[PDB]
Design a protein around this ligand. Structure first.
Ligand code: U0P
Ligand code: ZN
Ligand code: ZN
Ligand code: ZN
Ligand code: ZN
Lengths: 71, 72
C-alpha cells in the first residue's frame, strides 16, 4: 500500500544517515576527538586535520563499535 | 499489507538498536574510551566504571554527535 511506501522511505533515510559523509559508501565507525563528531568511516577520518562539521582540530580519532553496525 | 507489518518491524528494530542498552529509553550518544563500545546514553555511561559489553575499565566517556540523532 501507500503506507508500505512511506515506511520504505523512513527506513532508507535512517540507513543513509549511518553512512560516511565523505565517501557515502562505508558505515560511520570513527569519532573526531575531542569535538565528538562521528560522521566518517575509518579511511575518510584518517587524514583529516580538522573536523568536517565544526572545524575543530582533530587531536585523534576514536574507533566506535555501534549496535547498528552490519557491514 | 503483510509487507507493511514487516517494514514496521524492521524500523522498530533499527530504532531500538539506537537506544541505550542499559535504560532502553534514551538515544545512544556516548562512547566508553578506550574500548570504543558506543552503547549507552550519557546518564547510564556516567555511572559505569567498567564497559557493559567488554568489561574493560572506562578511562573516560566521549560524547558522540551522530547524524541519526533525533529530539522533541
Ligand atoms: C565545515 C563547516 C561548515 C560550518 C558551518 N557552520 C556551523 C559555521 O560556519 N558556523 C559559524 C560559527 C562559525 N562549520 O564548519
Ligand atoms: Zn568514508
Ligand atoms: Zn566537530
Ligand atoms: Zn541509558
Ligand atoms: Zn567495551
Amino acid at each position: 500500500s501507500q503506507q508500505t511506501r512511506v515506511l520504505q522511505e523512513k527506513l532508507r533515510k535512517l540507513k543513509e544517515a549511518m553512512l560516511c559523509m565523505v565517501c557515502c559508501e562505508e558505515e560511520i565507525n570513527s569519532t573526531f576527538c575531542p569535538c565528538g563528531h562521528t560522521v566518517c568511516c575509518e579511511s575518510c577520518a584518517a587524514q583529516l586535520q580538522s573536523c568536517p562539521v565544526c572545524r575543530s582540530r582533530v587531536e585523534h580519532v576514536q574507533h566506535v563499535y555501534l549496535p547498528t553496525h552490519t557491514s
